[PDB]
Amino acid sequence: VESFASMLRHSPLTQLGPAKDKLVIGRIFHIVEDDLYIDFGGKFHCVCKRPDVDGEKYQRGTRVRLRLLDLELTSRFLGGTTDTTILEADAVLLGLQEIR
Amino acid sequence: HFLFYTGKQSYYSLMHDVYGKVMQLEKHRAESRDLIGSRWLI
Amino acid sequence: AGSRLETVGSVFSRTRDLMRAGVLKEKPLWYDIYKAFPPLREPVFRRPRLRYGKAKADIQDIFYQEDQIRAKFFATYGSGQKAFDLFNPNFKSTCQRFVEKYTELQNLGETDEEKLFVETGKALLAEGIILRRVRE
Amino acid sequence: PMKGRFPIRRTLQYLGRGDVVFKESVKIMTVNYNTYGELGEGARKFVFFNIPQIQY
Amino acid sequence: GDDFQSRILDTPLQHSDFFNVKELFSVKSLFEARVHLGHKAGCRHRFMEPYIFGNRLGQDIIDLDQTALNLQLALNFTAHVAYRKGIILFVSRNRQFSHLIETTAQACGEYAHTRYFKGGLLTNAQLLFGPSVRLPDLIIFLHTLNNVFEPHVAVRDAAKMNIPTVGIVDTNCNPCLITYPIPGNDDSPQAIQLFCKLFRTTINRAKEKRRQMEALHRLQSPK
Amino acid sequence: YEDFDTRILEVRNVFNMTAKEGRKKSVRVLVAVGNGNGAAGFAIGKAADRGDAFRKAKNRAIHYLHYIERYEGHTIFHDISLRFKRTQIRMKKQPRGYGLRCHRAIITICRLIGIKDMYARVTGSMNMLNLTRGLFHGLARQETHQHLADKKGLHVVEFREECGPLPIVVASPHGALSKEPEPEPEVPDTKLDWQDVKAMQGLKRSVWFNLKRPAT
Ligand SMILES: [Mg+2]
């Protein structure tokens, strides 16, 4: 049986390195009006806006391309002993993935 | 009832059904005025 | 009658004590189970305190030896134009193939980091991978 | 709380625990010790703990 | 007669894994569900550092070896409670998983409270529910924080009533009052979906095991 | 709860400002409860009528029952010294027949707890709530001999002067008995109280010390 230490070393998330300015593939699982909730394989989902071009194509289950920025949006503010998290990730939707 | 400890088992049992219906319709995918001259119950 | 003092002892210790006193006449149904299969730690209240002066936490930064190679690849070529797929448990990115070949050459015995970096680029070029040395 | 370090040294029971009663010949006992070092630790502890018992 | 009742209730406690909950999960299964992913280092609670494998570029990683040990104990305890016909209440305030947790409780045969928690629900239950209301015998906290990033009120109130709690605790959570903490990810849908499946299979096995144990011992009395 | 007895410790009658009568009346009552067998608790009850404050405090305290460990059912397991806010308490374990030589409020609570022989001194502020909270805080955090045997793995042995050199085993480790002797320093670093030590140094006590008093 593979050990947890081995799994972590060979994990796709461990290979990604820093998540800033990386390219990843996501899947839309929830849509609210023109806001798309996209799971890209991390702990937290991201939320992007439906692009003007080919808007109808972005439906649930559609795989897309993203440019990660942060895996979790968090920031400490004055008089806070812990970071304030919004339980969301930051990414820029680039467009649909070619099925090919 | 499985929602007894909520304190409003009947209100939340109804909100459970309508939220599950909404999810199946959104996952699965005309004029909505099937009924006219009607109001929501008070 | 009970012990609603959740800052002294634990649910089990307070239940053990109440029965010894004589206030709780019937064991709870979860009591015997806790006695036979207790948790690893006793659930006792503790007030979180802050660290002061030179006290620090003890958390190891996770850095494998491949990261030295991966850092160079991202600085020299950036992220591979192919998009990461983090849903495939066995996905091999362009960078991870670079690190697999870089390791193979290092096993042969090459000791110069510069030699291993340019030779790996040539090998992947033969494989057909499109590596762009983007300084931008 | 009694002041100082090891306040038990300032109790009559501790002072009476000393067992070194010098012969009548002994008149002076000079103690030369160093405050810093590693080989003089026992000497420093002797001044701290034992000199009161000897004087008592 | 008396021996049969003693056999049903006393025999299960003589085996380390009477319900064989070990097979339900594995470290690999937990790793597939992203149960090792924690909040950023800034959000870390001091009482969670024992369970954290390390910090992978700002993201705390949760040791999945401790999770397997702790999860084994928590699932075993949840099974013996379900075996003895105790009331189990699932509690969470995460609204993404509100419907999933209510569906799980209904499938198990237990109870869920995913809505706003009224002050005094457990410490003043007689006024709210009735004179002879039976409180839960176990509370499973799939989430131990409320939506203002503070401990769910039922964590402290369940300790006041001497109710054991099986809770999923993440890197920003406070496990001190959780009787059986399960260190792991609580935000990812794949992590929560795995835990809900484990708790539901475990509860159903224990309930089925009780039925079979009763029939065998009951049949012996005539036979 | 016929086995439990309730005792009052403080009763404050204070007038407060509210639009009903301009100045409204309020009674704050601190009580203690105990069965005399180790289980005891305290609570504060407030009302406009004294009777209502008595009922509220009495039934609230039955929900906050500490269990206090008594050595051989008559005394605390060891000396206890603590400061709760500005109220310092210093309790001492005593032999049988010593009685309760303590602040009148500590005598009241000790009877509810079941402690029969102890000494205590209270200094600083005499606030009744801080003394009650501080008392239960120390009595409920004390270490029984069995706990000490388990923590260190060694036997806990007792030596009474009325039994001579006879060693009495009061607690044996539940698991594995260790073989490393507990380190014995030549001179302990204990922090001593001048009040305790002053007596053994031969210093005259006050005229008020150790006076003849009725059986407590
Ligand atoms: Mg979380």
Short mmCIF file of N, CA, C and O in Angstrom, two decimals, chain E residues 47-150:
data_model
loop_
_atom_site.label_atom_id
_atom_site.label_comp_id
_atom_site.label_asym_id
_atom_site.label_seq_id
_atom_site.Cartn_x
_atom_site.Cartn_y
_atom_site.Cartn_z
N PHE E 47 -4.73 24.50 18.33
CA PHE E 47 -5.00 23.15 18.78
C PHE E 47 -5.10 22.16 17.63
O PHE E 47 -5.39 20.98 17.86
N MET E 48 -4.88 22.61 16.40
CA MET E 48 -4.88 21.74 15.23
C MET E 48 -3.48 21.38 14.77
O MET E 48 -3.32 20.46 13.96
N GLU E 49 -2.46 22.09 15.26
CA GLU E 49 -1.09 21.82 14.82
C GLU E 49 -0.65 20.38 15.03
O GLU E 49 0.16 19.89 14.23
N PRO E 50 -1.11 19.66 16.06
CA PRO E 50 -0.76 18.23 16.15
C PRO E 50 -1.14 17.43 14.93
O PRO E 50 -0.44 16.47 14.58
N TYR E 51 -2.25 17.77 14.27
CA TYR E 51 -2.80 16.97 13.19
C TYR E 51 -2.29 17.38 11.81
O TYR E 51 -2.63 16.71 10.83
N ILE E 52 -1.49 18.43 11.71
CA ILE E 52 -1.08 18.99 10.43
C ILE E 52 0.24 18.37 10.01
O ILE E 52 1.24 18.46 10.73
N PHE E 53 0.25 17.74 8.83
CA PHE E 53 1.47 17.13 8.31
C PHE E 53 2.52 18.18 7.97
O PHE E 53 3.71 17.97 8.19
N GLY E 54 2.09 19.33 7.46
CA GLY E 54 3.02 20.40 7.14
C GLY E 54 2.33 21.49 6.36
O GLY E 54 1.10 21.50 6.22
N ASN E 55 3.13 22.43 5.87
CA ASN E 55 2.65 23.58 5.11
C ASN E 55 3.23 23.54 3.70
O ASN E 55 4.41 23.85 3.50
N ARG E 56 2.41 23.16 2.73
CA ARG E 56 2.81 23.10 1.32
C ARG E 56 2.54 24.45 0.67
O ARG E 56 1.47 24.69 0.10
N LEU E 57 3.52 25.34 0.73
CA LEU E 57 3.46 26.64 0.07
C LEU E 57 2.25 27.45 0.53
O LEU E 57 1.48 28.00 -0.27
N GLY E 58 2.07 27.53 1.85
CA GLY E 58 1.02 28.33 2.45
C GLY E 58 -0.22 27.56 2.83
O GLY E 58 -0.98 28.03 3.68
N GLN E 59 -0.45 26.40 2.23
CA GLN E 59 -1.62 25.58 2.52
C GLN E 59 -1.23 24.47 3.47
O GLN E 59 -0.43 23.59 3.12
N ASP E 60 -1.80 24.49 4.67
CA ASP E 60 -1.55 23.42 5.62
C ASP E 60 -2.10 22.10 5.09
O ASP E 60 -3.20 22.05 4.54
N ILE E 61 -1.32 21.04 5.25
CA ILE E 61 -1.70 19.70 4.83
C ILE E 61 -1.99 18.89 6.08
O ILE E 61 -1.27 18.97 7.07
N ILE E 62 -3.06 18.10 6.03
CA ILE E 62 -3.53 17.34 7.17
C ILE E 62 -3.02 15.92 7.04
O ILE E 62 -3.25 15.25 6.03
N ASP E 63 -2.32 15.44 8.07
CA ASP E 63 -1.81 14.08 8.06
C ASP E 63 -2.96 13.10 7.95
O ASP E 63 -3.82 13.04 8.83
N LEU E 64 -2.98 12.33 6.87
CA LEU E 64 -4.05 11.37 6.64
C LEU E 64 -3.81 10.06 7.37
O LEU E 64 -4.64 9.15 7.28
N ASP E 65 -2.70 9.94 8.10
CA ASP E 65 -2.44 8.77 8.92
C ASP E 65 -3.12 8.90 10.28
O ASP E 65 -3.72 7.94 10.78
N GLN E 66 -3.03 10.09 10.89
CA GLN E 66 -3.82 10.37 12.08
C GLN E 66 -5.31 10.38 11.77
O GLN E 66 -6.12 9.91 12.58
N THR E 67 -5.69 10.91 10.61
CA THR E 67 -7.10 10.92 10.23
C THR E 67 -7.67 9.51 10.19
O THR E 67 -8.81 9.29 10.61
N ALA E 68 -6.90 8.56 9.67
CA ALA E 68 -7.38 7.18 9.61
C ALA E 68 -7.57 6.60 11.01
O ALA E 68 -8.57 5.93 11.28
N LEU E 69 -6.62 6.85 11.91
CA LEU E 69 -6.77 6.37 13.29
C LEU E 69 -7.97 7.02 13.97
O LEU E 69 -8.82 6.33 14.55
N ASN E 70 -8.05 8.35 13.91
CA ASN E 70 -9.16 9.04 14.56
C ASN E 70 -10.49 8.69 13.92
O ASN E 70 -11.49 8.49 14.62
N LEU E 71 -10.53 8.60 12.59
CA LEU E 71 -11.77 8.26 11.91
C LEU E 71 -12.22 6.85 12.28
O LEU E 71 -13.43 6.59 12.39
N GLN E 72 -11.28 5.93 12.47
CA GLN E 72 -11.63 4.58 12.88
C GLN E 72 -12.35 4.59 14.23
O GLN E 72 -13.39 3.95 14.40
N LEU E 73 -11.79 5.32 15.19
CA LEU E 73 -12.42 5.40 16.51
C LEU E 73 -13.79 6.06 16.43
O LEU E 73 -14.75 5.60 17.05
N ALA E 74 -13.89 7.15 15.67
CA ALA E 74 -15.15 7.87 15.56
C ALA E 74 -16.23 7.01 14.90
O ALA E 74 -17.38 7.01 15.33
N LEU E 75 -15.86 6.29 13.84
CA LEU E 75 -16.84 5.44 13.17
C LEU E 75 -17.25 4.26 14.04
O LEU E 75 -18.42 3.86 14.05
N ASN E 76 -16.30 3.69 14.78
CA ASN E 76 -16.63 2.59 15.69
C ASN E 76 -17.58 3.06 16.79
O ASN E 76 -18.56 2.39 17.11
N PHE E 77 -17.30 4.23 17.37
CA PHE E 77 -18.17 4.77 18.40
C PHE E 77 -19.56 5.07 17.84
O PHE E 77 -20.57 4.77 18.47
N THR E 78 -19.62 5.67 16.64
CA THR E 78 -20.90 5.95 16.00
C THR E 78 -21.68 4.68 15.70
O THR E 78 -22.91 4.74 15.61
N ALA E 79 -21.00 3.54 15.55
CA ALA E 79 -21.70 2.30 15.24
C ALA E 79 -22.29 1.68 16.50
O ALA E 79 -23.44 1.22 16.49
N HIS E 80 -21.53 1.66 17.59
CA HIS E 80 -22.05 1.12 18.84
C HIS E 80 -23.22 1.95 19.34
O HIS E 80 -24.18 1.40 19.90
N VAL E 81 -23.17 3.27 19.15
CA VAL E 81 -24.30 4.11 19.54
C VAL E 81 -25.51 3.78 18.69
O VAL E 81 -26.63 3.65 19.20
N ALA E 82 -25.31 3.63 17.38
CA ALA E 82 -26.42 3.26 16.50
C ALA E 82 -26.90 1.85 16.79
O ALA E 82 -28.10 1.56 16.69
N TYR E 83 -25.98 0.95 17.15
CA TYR E 83 -26.36 -0.42 17.48
C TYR E 83 -27.30 -0.45 18.68
O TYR E 83 -28.26 -1.23 18.70
N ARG E 84 -27.04 0.37 19.68
CA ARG E 84 -27.84 0.40 20.90
C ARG E 84 -29.12 1.22 20.76
O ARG E 84 -29.79 1.47 21.76
N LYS E 85 -29.45 1.65 19.54
CA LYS E 85 -30.69 2.37 19.24
C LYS E 85 -30.66 3.79 19.78
O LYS E 85 -31.71 4.36 20.11
N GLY E 86 -29.47 4.38 19.88
CA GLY E 86 -29.37 5.76 20.30
C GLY E 86 -29.74 6.73 19.20
O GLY E 86 -29.67 6.42 18.01
N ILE E 87 -30.13 7.93 19.61
CA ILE E 87 -30.49 8.99 18.67
C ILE E 87 -29.22 9.71 18.24
O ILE E 87 -28.41 10.13 19.07
N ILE E 88 -29.05 9.87 16.93
CA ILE E 88 -27.90 10.54 16.34
C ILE E 88 -28.40 11.75 15.57
O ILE E 88 -29.30 11.63 14.73
N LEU E 89 -27.83 12.92 15.86
CA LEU E 89 -28.22 14.16 15.21
C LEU E 89 -27.03 14.71 14.43
O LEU E 89 -25.98 14.99 15.00
N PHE E 90 -27.21 14.87 13.12
CA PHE E 90 -26.22 15.51 12.27
C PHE E 90 -26.43 17.02 12.32
O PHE E 90 -27.56 17.50 12.20
N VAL E 91 -25.34 17.76 12.49
CA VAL E 91 -25.41 19.20 12.68
C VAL E 91 -24.38 19.87 11.79
O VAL E 91 -23.20 19.49 11.79
N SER E 92 -24.82 20.87 11.03
CA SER E 92 -23.94 21.67 10.19
C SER E 92 -24.66 22.96 9.84
O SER E 92 -25.89 23.00 9.82
N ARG E 93 -23.89 24.01 9.57
CA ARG E 93 -24.46 25.26 9.10
C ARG E 93 -23.95 25.65 7.72
O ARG E 93 -24.26 26.75 7.24
N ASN E 94 -23.17 24.79 7.07
CA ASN E 94 -22.72 25.07 5.71
C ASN E 94 -23.89 24.89 4.77
O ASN E 94 -24.48 23.80 4.69
N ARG E 95 -24.24 25.95 4.04
CA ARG E 95 -25.45 25.96 3.24
C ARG E 95 -25.27 25.26 1.90
O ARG E 95 -26.25 24.83 1.30
N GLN E 96 -24.03 25.13 1.43
CA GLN E 96 -23.76 24.33 0.24
C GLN E 96 -24.16 22.87 0.46
O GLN E 96 -24.63 22.21 -0.47
N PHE E 97 -23.95 22.35 1.67
CA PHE E 97 -24.18 20.94 1.97
C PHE E 97 -25.40 20.72 2.86
O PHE E 97 -25.54 19.66 3.46
N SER E 98 -26.30 21.71 2.94
CA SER E 98 -27.46 21.57 3.80
C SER E 98 -28.39 20.46 3.32
O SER E 98 -28.85 19.64 4.11
N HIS E 99 -28.66 20.41 2.01
CA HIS E 99 -29.57 19.41 1.48
C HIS E 99 -28.94 18.02 1.51
O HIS E 99 -29.63 17.03 1.76
N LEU E 100 -27.64 17.93 1.23
CA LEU E 100 -26.97 16.64 1.26
C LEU E 100 -27.00 16.02 2.65
O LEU E 100 -27.22 14.81 2.80
N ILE E 101 -26.78 16.83 3.68
CA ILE E 101 -26.74 16.30 5.04
C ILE E 101 -28.13 15.91 5.52
O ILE E 101 -28.28 14.93 6.25
N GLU E 102 -29.16 16.65 5.11
CA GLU E 102 -30.52 16.27 5.45
C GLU E 102 -30.93 14.99 4.73
O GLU E 102 -31.69 14.18 5.27
N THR E 103 -30.45 14.80 3.50
CA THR E 103 -30.75 13.57 2.78
C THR E 103 -30.02 12.38 3.39
O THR E 103 -30.55 11.26 3.42
N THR E 104 -28.80 12.60 3.88
CA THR E 104 -28.05 11.52 4.52
C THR E 104 -28.75 11.06 5.80
O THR E 104 -28.96 9.86 6.00
N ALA E 105 -29.11 12.01 6.67
CA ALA E 105 -29.79 11.66 7.91
C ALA E 105 -31.05 10.85 7.63
O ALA E 105 -31.33 9.86 8.33
N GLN E 106 -31.83 11.25 6.63
CA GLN E 106 -33.06 10.53 6.31
C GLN E 106 -32.75 9.12 5.83
O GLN E 106 -33.47 8.17 6.15
N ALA E 107 -31.69 8.96 5.04
CA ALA E 107 -31.30 7.63 4.57
C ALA E 107 -30.86 6.74 5.73
O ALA E 107 -31.24 5.57 5.80
N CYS E 108 -30.05 7.29 6.64
CA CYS E 108 -29.59 6.51 7.78
C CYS E 108 -30.76 6.07 8.65
O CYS E 108 -30.79 4.95 9.16
N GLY E 109 -31.74 6.95 8.83
CA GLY E 109 -32.78 6.78 9.81
C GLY E 109 -32.60 7.66 11.03
O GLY E 109 -33.26 7.40 12.05
N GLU E 110 -31.75 8.67 10.96
CA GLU E 110 -31.41 9.53 12.08
C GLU E 110 -31.94 10.94 11.81
O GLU E 110 -32.91 11.12 11.06
N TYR E 111 -31.32 11.94 12.43
CA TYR E 111 -31.84 13.29 12.45
C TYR E 111 -30.78 14.28 11.99
O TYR E 111 -29.58 14.06 12.16
N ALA E 112 -31.24 15.38 11.40
CA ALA E 112 -30.36 16.43 10.92
C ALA E 112 -30.90 17.78 11.36
O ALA E 112 -32.12 18.00 11.37
N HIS E 113 -30.00 18.68 11.73
CA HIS E 113 -30.33 20.07 12.04
C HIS E 113 -29.32 20.94 11.31
O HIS E 113 -28.22 21.18 11.81
N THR E 114 -29.69 21.40 10.12
CA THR E 114 -28.82 22.22 9.28
C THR E 114 -29.23 23.68 9.26
O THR E 114 -28.64 24.47 8.52
N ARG E 115 -30.22 24.06 10.06
CA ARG E 115 -30.80 25.39 10.06
C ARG E 115 -30.28 26.19 11.25
O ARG E 115 -29.46 25.73 12.04
N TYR E 116 -30.77 27.43 11.35
CA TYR E 116 -30.40 28.29 12.47
C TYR E 116 -30.71 27.60 13.79
O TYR E 116 -31.82 27.10 14.00
N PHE E 117 -29.73 27.57 14.68
CA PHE E 117 -29.84 26.86 15.95
C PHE E 117 -30.37 27.82 17.01
O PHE E 117 -29.75 28.85 17.29
N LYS E 118 -31.51 27.49 17.60
CA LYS E 118 -32.13 28.35 18.60
C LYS E 118 -31.41 28.23 19.94
O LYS E 118 -31.10 27.12 20.40
N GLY E 119 -31.16 29.37 20.57
CA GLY E 119 -30.54 29.39 21.88
C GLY E 119 -31.37 28.63 22.89
O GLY E 119 -32.54 28.94 23.10
N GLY E 120 -30.76 27.63 23.53
CA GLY E 120 -31.44 26.82 24.51
C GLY E 120 -31.99 25.52 23.99
O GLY E 120 -32.69 24.83 24.74
N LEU E 121 -31.72 25.17 22.73
CA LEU E 121 -32.29 23.96 22.16
C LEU E 121 -31.98 22.73 23.01
O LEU E 121 -32.83 21.86 23.18
N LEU E 122 -30.76 22.65 23.54
CA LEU E 122 -30.36 21.51 24.36
C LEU E 122 -30.38 21.80 25.85
O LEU E 122 -30.75 20.92 26.63
N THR E 123 -30.02 23.02 26.27
CA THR E 123 -30.01 23.35 27.69
C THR E 123 -31.39 23.73 28.20
O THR E 123 -31.58 23.78 29.42
N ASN E 124 -32.34 23.98 27.31
CA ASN E 124 -33.69 24.36 27.67
C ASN E 124 -34.68 23.60 26.80
O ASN E 124 -35.70 24.15 26.36
N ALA E 125 -34.39 22.33 26.55
CA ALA E 125 -35.15 21.56 25.58
C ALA E 125 -36.59 21.34 26.02
O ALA E 125 -37.49 21.27 25.18
N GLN E 126 -36.83 21.21 27.33
CA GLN E 126 -38.18 20.90 27.80
C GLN E 126 -39.15 22.01 27.43
O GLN E 126 -40.30 21.73 27.06
N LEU E 127 -38.71 23.26 27.52
CA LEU E 127 -39.58 24.37 27.16
C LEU E 127 -39.87 24.38 25.66
O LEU E 127 -40.98 24.70 25.24
N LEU E 128 -38.87 24.02 24.84
CA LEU E 128 -39.02 24.12 23.39
C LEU E 128 -39.81 22.95 22.81
O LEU E 128 -40.68 23.17 21.96
N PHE E 129 -39.51 21.72 23.23
CA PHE E 129 -40.07 20.54 22.59
C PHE E 129 -41.18 19.87 23.38
O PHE E 129 -42.03 19.21 22.77
N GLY E 130 -41.19 20.00 24.70
CA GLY E 130 -42.16 19.32 25.52
C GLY E 130 -41.55 18.77 26.79
O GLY E 130 -40.33 18.75 26.95
N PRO E 131 -42.40 18.31 27.71
CA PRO E 131 -41.87 17.92 29.03
C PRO E 131 -40.94 16.72 29.00
O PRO E 131 -39.94 16.71 29.71
N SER E 132 -41.25 15.71 28.18
CA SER E 132 -40.52 14.45 28.20
C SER E 132 -39.64 14.26 26.96
O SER E 132 -39.34 13.12 26.59
N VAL E 133 -39.22 15.35 26.32
CA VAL E 133 -38.44 15.23 25.09
C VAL E 133 -37.13 14.52 25.39
O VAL E 133 -36.43 14.84 26.36
N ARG E 134 -36.79 13.55 24.55
CA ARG E 134 -35.52 12.84 24.64
C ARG E 134 -34.48 13.55 23.77
O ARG E 134 -34.69 13.72 22.57
N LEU E 135 -33.38 13.97 24.38
CA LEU E 135 -32.33 14.66 23.65
C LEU E 135 -31.48 13.66 22.86
O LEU E 135 -31.55 12.45 23.09
N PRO E 136 -30.69 14.15 21.91
CA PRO E 136 -29.82 13.25 21.15
C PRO E 136 -28.78 12.57 22.03
O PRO E 136 -28.25 13.18 22.97
N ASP E 137 -28.49 11.31 21.72
CA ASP E 137 -27.45 10.57 22.41
C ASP E 137 -26.08 10.75 21.78
O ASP E 137 -25.07 10.46 22.43
N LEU E 138 -26.02 11.23 20.54
CA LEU E 138 -24.76 11.54 19.88
C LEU E 138 -25.03 12.62 18.84
O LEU E 138 -26.05 12.60 18.16
N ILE E 139 -24.11 13.58 18.74
CA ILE E 139 -24.17 14.64 17.75
C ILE E 139 -22.95 14.53 16.85
O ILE E 139 -21.81 14.57 17.33
N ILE E 140 -23.18 14.39 15.55
CA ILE E 140 -22.12 14.35 14.56
C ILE E 140 -22.04 15.71 13.88
O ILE E 140 -22.99 16.13 13.21
N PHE E 141 -20.92 16.40 14.08
CA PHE E 141 -20.70 17.74 13.52
C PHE E 141 -19.89 17.62 12.24
O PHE E 141 -18.66 17.61 12.26
N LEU E 142 -20.59 17.54 11.11
CA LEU E 142 -19.89 17.62 9.83
C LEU E 142 -19.20 18.96 9.66
O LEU E 142 -18.16 19.05 8.99
N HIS E 143 -19.75 20.02 10.25
CA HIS E 143 -19.10 21.31 10.35
C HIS E 143 -19.24 21.80 11.79
O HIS E 143 -20.34 21.75 12.35
N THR E 144 -18.14 22.25 12.38
CA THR E 144 -18.13 22.71 13.76
C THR E 144 -18.14 24.23 13.88
O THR E 144 -18.15 24.75 14.99
N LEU E 145 -18.12 24.95 12.76
CA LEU E 145 -18.18 26.40 12.76
C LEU E 145 -19.51 26.85 12.16
O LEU E 145 -20.09 26.17 11.31
N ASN E 146 -19.99 28.00 12.62
CA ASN E 146 -21.16 28.63 12.05
C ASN E 146 -20.71 29.56 10.92
O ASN E 146 -19.54 29.59 10.56
N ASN E 147 -21.64 30.32 10.35
CA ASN E 147 -21.33 31.12 9.17
C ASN E 147 -20.66 32.44 9.51
O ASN E 147 -20.31 33.19 8.59
N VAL E 148 -20.45 32.74 10.79
CA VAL E 148 -19.66 33.89 11.20
C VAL E 148 -18.28 33.46 11.70
O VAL E 148 -17.60 34.23 12.37
N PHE E 149 -17.86 32.24 11.36
CA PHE E 149 -16.53 31.74 11.69
C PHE E 149 -16.31 31.70 13.20
O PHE E 149 -15.25 32.08 13.71
N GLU E 150 -17.31 31.23 13.92
CA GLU E 150 -17.26 30.99 15.35
C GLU E 150 -17.75 29.57 15.61
O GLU E 150 -18.45 28.99 14.77
#
